[PDB]
Design a protein around this ligand. Structure first.
Ligand code: PCG
Ligand code: PCG
Ligand code: PCG
Ligand code: PCG
Ligand code: MG
Ligand code: MG
Ligand code: ZN
Lengths: 816, 816, 35, 34
């Protein structure tokens, strides 16, 4: 009524209101004596605002609800600023470009939450540069527009859509640590032509509480999103590192596991091919003209686009995950064409309001009987370390209903990025399978070229003539009758003597003599060894040995025969069971199996694959590995009619004996055998010593280890007419290695391995006798008095070699 | 002036006018910096005006730069004045190793205090367990606790009271709530005037706790969000460094921990790797059992192995980055001297240490370890778990950067990193496994190469250099080898080498080998490409040895196909379209097409799941023969292409690959209509010269023609005279019967009638069907292409007539 | 009904070819005898 | 200082140290051979 007079007289109004008003009030007003706080109404408005703000603070304290608290602030701010309405514009980031969408629109001092809350399907999303709301967010600074008609950045799209007119706009972003959360805006000043300076000063200061709510709401959203990202990376790593699997199994496990944190109604993963080039018989129809060249989409790597398998995850309603090999182009996931486009370009695609999209043919309506309509889509490529796309992951219909924002974009991108690097595990898995298959093929090729065939076994075991049947069909009694007639007797060749010579027998007779050795030990009967298998195994070992100068099949029977002689003629069997003797003689056969002709040192220097695989005792472990592999074959397994405990004991015994042949290992443990033989003199008689020694396991293993060494160097203990020739074979093999070292390794060989210093051989033999063979046979002769012929013969051979070295030394001095 | 009466008559209009034109101004003044206007020097009851001023003062502190410590301190002073108290304190809630703790942050807060006199440094905090104390009672109860008298309280303790020389009579506390998990506790120590704190004082506390909760909630959310972001970044970068490549555990753990050095936020940390040697070799354990050395007595892992930190990597971050790797660290090392990493390996428990020098269990250094005064205060040591629960390392994290002791958030952040590192041991485990597998494969490939290679003694059967010149083959000159070869090799005209009716029945395998070198000489590819004659002879003998001794697909079949190709290229004048190098590769391809044939077709390889089937997918044996042939040619001593150009070698290898892969029938059957068009083009062309010129350029036409030549040479047994075809068909039938028997024995599948041994009398009918099905099309079209191939067509027709007669005789016999 | 007077779609006042995010590539005496 | 503690954090009850347990609970042609 009289408002115009009061406006025309600001001084009178200030003076009148500054008067102290009576104790009487209007309505309640929480009058705890507050009529005169330097103004009649100042306390009344202070009390009302303090009470109103306190209620807002209580709302923030429990069950944080930004929409309601901001609504109350905006509703109160509408009366404060006299703006016809207020609004809230949330900030979102999609595809790397910022957008702003409405959450609370056209709030009035007499409005309610239901009439102001904007559902996600009714959002007016505003890019950063198509409105004043965009200009405020881009500048990160408040904007006060007195009249909007002349505003360069204004767009009438929103006010024409809602049938409204705007004249003055206030807006400021709600920053949170340099990041924009939202921008509250008030429009249409109802009282004045525009918004004054004091009106705007209130807008900044009164909005601190609204800033706090959005700061709390933003932090809670960020905290929850980062928590979910940490879980998916942790769960994916757990499933990826579970084992080595192909792409399909590894990707299926990871995506299925993290289905809880994704918050997507549906998502499908399509796997791309990796065939870089087609084979020739597929190129011929294209080049000749029988078929047309492929002209469809291609990867950035220049690869044909073909999803050979699409995995479908359905999380809305019922969980019925499907895997579709060779999916058709009519598949609901691939029909839209977005998974295709992502693979062509390698982009990250975020789609809001999918039915309104134009480039991608998204389905018009429901997909299945459940009436599920695709609304928001997010697709990214799965790229490995070599910058190649191996698949496309596409997520649909965020569970909350809001479009896929930046936080969801980085959550799924991290999952795909981690899984992309995990492709190296699949590539390693494929390579390992290829290596294993290639090794098995090579092993089979080894076995055939080494195993005795059907026609070769007839030389030792003729059954097609005596009986007319193949050996696999003859009974064991018949086979023994054939062998007993064919095999040489114990007296035909002196296999029982320390002076046995193998230079007057053919290789076939050596194999036969080997079979005779097993028969004399009695191991054929008690262990029920298949006689056909025994012959086949012995021939296979003979073929397994190479055709080199010294480390040939002949060395491997002489060591075996010497071990047989030691057990039976040296009477060292008293400490060993028949089974232990059975394994001990066999280790003599495989003592130098597949020896390449070069010592252990040459393997390391030449960097053979043997050196990398073993490291210590390179060749000795190689012989054990090859011998056990040869024994693992069914047709060559003499250790087949044995108990599991017995078979393991035989294998374990073979491991020590084979590796004990290494001279480096012998030199470090020969003192232990010196202690053991000294303990023999402590005892009274051999009977007591036999009883004590036959029970101790480590002591028996130590003696057997140097029993390998004694048999290994047994060639020296042979008579001089044999040692002289064998030493030449040993020297020739070492010269062959010496020539090899000079050729490829380009290293000067030692005088022992040098062909030029061949005249020094007698001196080297004497030094080697006085270094290694002296200890082994001296202690064994002291240990067992039956080994004395091995020691006397060595001394005679040392005397013969000493004379030759002296004669060579005299010739050199005479020449000098 | 009369309007003043109007305003007084209706004060509601005056209030509305003020709410219109002065409320914004008043709120702006209140929300300005300003200060509290309440007299804090008395204890009068708080008026609603004073209540509003206090509330506005608290809301003033609500800014973007929300310093939690300062803002809580102010409301603590306001609570002091409101509650009439003497002092209050605030304790943060920290979670050590499972057991929660309460540590002070704001202490001794009175109405006339400042932040500097109340803020508590991390080294001045008073940690409190949950069990003891009124504060511990508050946190456990999760509700407000009022203590009218400390003497009667059952949880009151005098530890701080003695420590601070203060006496507490009345304790009033309340835990700050952020959801359910407690964040801080604010408590009061005394009442200035009054027996205790009344219910009105309690109501004030919960009323004013809203601001404290809001300030504390923001701080807690920010800390949690930052910790989750750090965890996510740690996991992502660690995954990137793990999946960079496949390496050992030392290099892998180095990369991941060095990369996350910024996110870790630790001044120092060191990781010690445990040795994985579970079991020691026999020679290493002999002295222990023999008494030479005493057994191990030191710390032992839960798995039973000795604790041996063989390699420790330490990271120094407080000053200059000094990352160091210490192989075989001594116990004097700063990380292991305390014994905490040793203890963790013993047990396997996550350990958080606060004030390590004050600890007595471990001998932590109590002196500055660095020249700058760096001193160990907080330590966190955790295991690396591993998939098999076998601890592979111990990660120890030293002093935190901010100075606060390690809490549950840092425990979880490092726990995720250690769990991920323990999961990422499959890669180092696979790295060693793949290396060992590759070495074993190389060893066995060397074995097969030696077993198939012709040795130096066998080559003298052809290249008799020793009996002619006395030198080794590798020493003789090129001319000398030719003269020996010229005398030794057979004559092409005498043996009918370039004929279509060549029979290998009256020739030995060595003679067939000698024939092939003669074919190579006749093709004039030896002088043109300067092929080493010694390698050429050795290559053919190695092929002969590599060919298996199985019934049909033996070396004789390999030579006959090559003989057929040579006879084609020479007699049928099919070399006009092919270069000399192409002729050289084609004959070699024909010779090597069936190298190392197991004797079973492709179907048996798939059905039996042979390692060839797993490796090769489409053409099992044909790819294997190509692979083995290329491996044979790769050998230096067997390479006949060593003198070819890089382009020339690649062209020959590609052409050989085409031929050998096309040798199969499945590819031939599909790509045979193309051959029908090729001969049709020849007939369309007028004279042979233009057509020959066209073929001399076009490559896809030549390659298809070559495949037809291969599939015609492979089936060339059918076109040989009846005396030869009668025997070869029996060999083919015998091989198929062997494969059928193998199928029936191994796979329990009924063999097909072609492969059935029982249906041996149906062989003529099957041969007639095979002739009408496969060979007829090839030999009819080849005869049309070249008139010189007519004798081939005559041969197949006669053989088909004989087989038809035999089939008719068998049918007549079965008719009855 | 909604106060924004739009149903069934987050209507965008921008009409143009959509832009899609690029992938992040920010590295995110014994020796005498050969023994 | 306010808490009268200069050296380091102090605990009222001092016994043998306690350590957390490791987290493990969460994780015609066919006739012829072809
Ligand atoms: N009807 C109505 N329109 C608004 C409201 N708030 C903002 N707008 C309008 O939405 C528009 C978005 O872009 P502008 O900021 O340039 O200008 C704005 C205003 O014209 C509101 O509360 N009600
Ligand atoms: N100098 C010399 N060394 C030998 C002799 N006999 C064996 N060796 C060496 O001793 C080693 C042990 O047995 P090996 O056959 O494995 O290889 C042998 C050779 O290296 C020999 O008579 N003279
Ligand atoms: N001197 C002093 N002592 C306090 C303060 N706050 C808490 N305390 C004391 O620290 C103690 C912790 O255990 P109690 O809760 O049983 O009792 C408490 C009080 O006695 C403070 O601000 N100043
Ligand atoms: N039924 C039948 N098949 C043959 C005959 N000759 C060759 N084949 C088949 O044709 C194939 C040609 O390639 P292969 O030599 O590897 O194996 C051969 C055999 O499988 C034959 O005389 N009769
Ligand atoms: Mg050896
Ligand atoms: Mg073949
Ligand atoms: Zn063939």
């Amino acid at each position: 009524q009289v408002h115009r007079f009061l406006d025309q007289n600001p001084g009178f109004a200030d003076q009148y209101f500054g008067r102290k008003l009576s104790p009487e009030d209007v309505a309640n007003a929480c009058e705890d004596g507050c009529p005169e706080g330097c103004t009649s109404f100042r306390e009344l408005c202070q009390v009302e605002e303090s009470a109103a703000l306190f209620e807002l603070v209580q709302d923030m304290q429990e069950n944080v609800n930004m929409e309601r608290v901001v609504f109350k602030i905006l509703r109160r701010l509408c009366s404060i600023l006299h703006a016809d309405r207020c609004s809230l514009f949330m900030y979102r980031q999609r595809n790397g470009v910022a957008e702003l969408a409405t959450r609370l629109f056209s709030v009035q001092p007499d409005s309610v939450l239901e009439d102001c809350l904007v559902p996600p399907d009714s959002e007016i999303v505003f890019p950063l540069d198509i409105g004043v709301v965009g200009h405020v967010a881009q500048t990160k600074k408040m904007v006060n527009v007195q009249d909007v008609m002349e505003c360069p950045h204004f767009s009438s799209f929103a006010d024409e859509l809602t049938d409204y007119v705007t004249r003055n706009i206030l807006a400021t972003p709600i920053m949170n640590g340099k990041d924009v959360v939202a921008v509250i805006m008030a429009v249409n000043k109802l009282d004045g032509p525009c918004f004054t300076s004091e009106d705007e000063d209130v807008f900044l200061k009164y909005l601190n509480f609204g800033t706090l709510n959005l700061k709390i709401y933003h932090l809670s959203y960020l905290h929850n999103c980062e928590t979910r990202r940490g879980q998916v990376l942790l769960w994916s790593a757990n499933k990826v590192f579970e084992e080595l699997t192909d792409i399909e199994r590894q990707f299926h496990k990871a995506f299925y596991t993290v289905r809880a944190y994704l918050n997507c109604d549906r998502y499908s993963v399509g796997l791309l091919d990796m065939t870089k080039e087609k084979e020739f018989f597929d190129v011929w129809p294209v080049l000749m003209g029988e078929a047309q060249a492929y002209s469809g989409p291609r990867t950035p790597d220049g690869r044909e686009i073909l999803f050979y398998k699409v995995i479908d995850y359905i999380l809305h309603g019922k969980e019925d995950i499907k895997v579709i090999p060779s999916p058709p182009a009519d598949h609901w996931a691939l029909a839209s064409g977005l998974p295709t486009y992502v693979a062509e370009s390698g982009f990250i695609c975020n789609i809001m309001n999918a039915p309104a999209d134009e480039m991608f043919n998204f389905q018009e309506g429901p997909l299945d009987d459940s009436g599920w309509i695709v609304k928001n889509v997010l697709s990214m490529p799965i790229v490995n370390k070599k910058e190649e796309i191996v698949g496309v992951a596409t997520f649909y219909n965020r569970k909350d209903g809001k479009p896929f924002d930046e936080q969801d974009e980085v959550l799924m991108e991290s999952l795909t990025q981690f899984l992309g690097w995990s492709v190296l595990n699949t590539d390693t898995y494929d390579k390992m399978n290829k290596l294993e298959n290639r090794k098995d093929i090579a092993q089979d090729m080894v076995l055939y070229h080494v195993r005795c065939d059907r026609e070769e076994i007839q030389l030792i075991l003729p059954t097609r003539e005596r009986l007319g049947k193949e050996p696999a069909d003859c009974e064991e009694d018949e086979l023994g009758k054939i062998l007993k007639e064919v095999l040489p007797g114990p007296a035909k060749f002196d296999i029982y003597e320390f002076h046995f010579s193998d230079l007057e027998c053919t290789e076939l007779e050596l194999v036969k003599c080997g079979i005779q050795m097993y028969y004399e030990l009695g191991v054929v009967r008690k262990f029920q060894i298949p006689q056909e298998v025994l012959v086949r195994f012995l021939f296979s070992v003979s073929k397994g040995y190479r055709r080199i100068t010294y480390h040939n099949w002949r060395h491997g029977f002489n060591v075996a025969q010497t071990m047989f002689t030691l057990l039976m003629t040296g009477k060292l069997k008293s400490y060993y069971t028949d089974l232990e003797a059975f394994a001990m003689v066999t280790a003599g056969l495989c003592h130098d199996i597949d020896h390449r002709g070069t010592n252990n040192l040459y393997q390391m220097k030449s960097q053979n694959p043997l050196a990398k695989l073993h490291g210590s005792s390179i060749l000795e472990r190689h012989h054990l590995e090859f011998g056990k592999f040869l024994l693992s074959e069914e047709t060559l397994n003499i250790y087949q009619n044995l108990n599991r405990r017995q078979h393991e004991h035989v294998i374990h015994l073979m491991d020590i004996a084979i590796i004990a042949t290494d001279l480096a290992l012998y030199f470090k443990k020969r003192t232990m055998f010196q202690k053991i033989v000294d303990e023999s003199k402590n005892y009274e008689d051999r009977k007591s010593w036999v009883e004590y020694l036959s029970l101790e396991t480590t002591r028996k293993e130590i003696v057997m280890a140097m029993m390998m060494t004694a048999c290994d160097l047994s060639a020296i203990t042979k008579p001089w007419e044999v040692q002289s020739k064998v030493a030449l074979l040993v020297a020739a093999e070492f010269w062959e290695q010496g020539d090899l070292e000079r050729t490829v390794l380009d290293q000067q060989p030692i005088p022992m391995m040098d062909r030029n210093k061949a005249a020094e051989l007698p001196k080297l033999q004497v030094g080697f006798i006085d270094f290694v063979c002296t200890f082994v046979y001296k202690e064994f002769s002291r240990f067992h008095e039956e080994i004395l012929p091995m020691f006397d013969r060595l001394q005679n051979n040392r005397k013969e070699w000493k004379a030759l070295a002296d004669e060579y030394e005299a010739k050199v001095k005479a020449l000098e | 002036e009369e309007v003043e009466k109007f305003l007084d008559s209706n004060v509601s209009f005056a209030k509305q006018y003020y709410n219109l034109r002065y409320r914004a101004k008043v709120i702006s003044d209140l929300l300005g910096p300003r200060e509290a206007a309440v007299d804090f020097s008395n204890y009068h009851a708080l008026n609603s005006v004073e209540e509003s001023e206090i509330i506005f003062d608290l809301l003033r502190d609500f800014q973007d730069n929300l310093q939690a410590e300062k803002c809580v301190f102010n409301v603590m002073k306001k609570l002091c004045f409101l509650l009439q108290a003497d002092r209050m304190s605030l304790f943060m809630y920290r979670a050590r190793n499972g057991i929660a703790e309460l540590a002070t942050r704001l202490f001794n807060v009175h109405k006339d205090a400042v932040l500097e006199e109340c803020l508590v440094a991390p080294d001045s905090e008073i940690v409190f367990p949950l069990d003891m104390g009124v504060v511990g009672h508050v946190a456990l109860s999760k509700k407000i606790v009022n203590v009218p008298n400390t003497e009667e309280d059952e949880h009151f303790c005098d530890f701080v009271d003695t420590l601070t020389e203060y006496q507490t009579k009345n304790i009033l506390a309340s835990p700050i709530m952020n959801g359910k998990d407690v964040v801080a506790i604010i408590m009061v120590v005394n009442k200035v005037d009054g027996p205790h704190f009344t219910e009105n004082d309690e109501e004030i506390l919960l009323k004013y706790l809203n601001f404290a909760n809001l300030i504390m909630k923001v701080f807690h959310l920010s800390y949690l969000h930052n910790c989750e972001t750090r965890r996510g970044q740690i996991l992502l970068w660690s995954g990137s460094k793990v999946f960079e490549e496949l390496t050992d555990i030392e290099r892998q753990f180095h990369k991941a921990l060095y990369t996350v050095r910024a996110f870790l936020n630790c001044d120092r940390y060191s990781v010690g790797l445990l040795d994985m040697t579970k079991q020691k070799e026999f020679f290493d354990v002999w002295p222990v059992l023999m008494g030479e050395a005493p057994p191990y007595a030191g710390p032992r892992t839960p798995d039973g192995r000795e604790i041996n930190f063989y390699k420790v990597i330490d990271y120094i971050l407080h000053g200059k980055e000094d990352i160091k790797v210490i192989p075989n660290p001594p116990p004097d090392h700063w990380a292991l001297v305390s014994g905490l990493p040793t203890y963790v390996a013993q047990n396997g428990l996550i350990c958080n240490i606060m004030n390590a020098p004050s600890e007595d269990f471990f001998a932590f250094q109590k002196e500055p370890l660095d020249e700058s005064g760096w001193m160990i205060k907080n330590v966190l040591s955790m295991p690396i778990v591993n998939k098999k629960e076998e601890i592979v390392g111990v990660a120890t994290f030293y002093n935190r950067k901010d100075g606060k002791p390690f809490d549950e958030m840092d425990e979880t952040l490092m726990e995720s990193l250690t769990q991920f590192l323990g999961w990422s041991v499959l890669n180092p485990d696979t790295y060693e496994l793949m290396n060992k597998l590759e070495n074993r494969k190389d060893i066995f490939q060397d074995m097969v190469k030696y077993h198939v290679k012709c040795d130096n003694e066998e080559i003298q059967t052809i290249l008799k250099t020793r009996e002619v010149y006395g030198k080794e083959p590798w020493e003789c000159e090129e001319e000398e080898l030719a003269e020996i070869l010229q005398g030794e090799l057979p004559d092409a005209d005498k043996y009918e080498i370039n004929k279509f009716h060549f029979s290998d029945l009256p020739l030995t395998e060595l003679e067939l080998v000698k024939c092939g070198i003669q074919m190579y000489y006749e093709l004039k590819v030896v002088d043109k490409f300067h092929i080493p004659q010694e390698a050429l002879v050795r290559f053919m003998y190695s092929l002969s040895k590599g060919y298996r001794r199985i019934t049909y697909h033996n070396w004789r079949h390999g030579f006959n196909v090559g003989q057929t190709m040579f006879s084609l290229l020479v007699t049928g004048k099919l070399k006009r379209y092919f270069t000399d190098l192409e002729a050289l590769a084609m004959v070699t391809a024909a010779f090597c097409h069936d190298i190392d044939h197991r004797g079973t077709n492709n179907l048996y390889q798939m059905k039996s799941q042979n390692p060839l089937a797993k490796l090769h997918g489409s053409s099992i044996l044909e790819r294997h023969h190509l692979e083995f042939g290329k491996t044979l040619l790769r050998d230096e001593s067997l390479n006949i292409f060593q003198n070819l150009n890089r382009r020339q070698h690649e062209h020959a290898i590609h052409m050989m690959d085409i031929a050998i892969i096309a040798t199969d029938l499945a590819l031939y059957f599909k790509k045979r209509t193309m051959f029908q068009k090729i001969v049709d083009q020849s007939k369309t062309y007028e004279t042979q010269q233009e057509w020959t010129q066209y073929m001399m350029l076009d490559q896809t036409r030549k390659e298809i023609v070559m495949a037809m030549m291969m599939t015609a040479c492979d089936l060339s047994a059918i076109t040989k005279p009846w005396e030869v075809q009668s025997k070869v068909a029996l060999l083919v039938a015998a091989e198929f019967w062997e494969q059928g028997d193998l199928e029936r024995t191994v796979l329990q599948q009924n063999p097909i009638p072609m492969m059935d041994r029982n249906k041996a009398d149906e062989l003529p009918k099957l041969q007639v069907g095979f002739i009408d099905f496969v060979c007829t099309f090839v030999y009819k079209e080849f005869s049309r292409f070249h008139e010189e191939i007519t004798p081939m067509l005559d041969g197949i027709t006669n053989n088909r007539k004989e087989w038809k007669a035999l089939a008719d005789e068998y049918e007549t016999k079965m008719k009855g | 009904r909604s106060a924004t007077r739009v149903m069934g779609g987050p209507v965008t006042p921008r009409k143009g070819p959509p832009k899609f995010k690029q992938r992040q590539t920010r590295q995110f005496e014994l020796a005498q005898y050969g023994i």
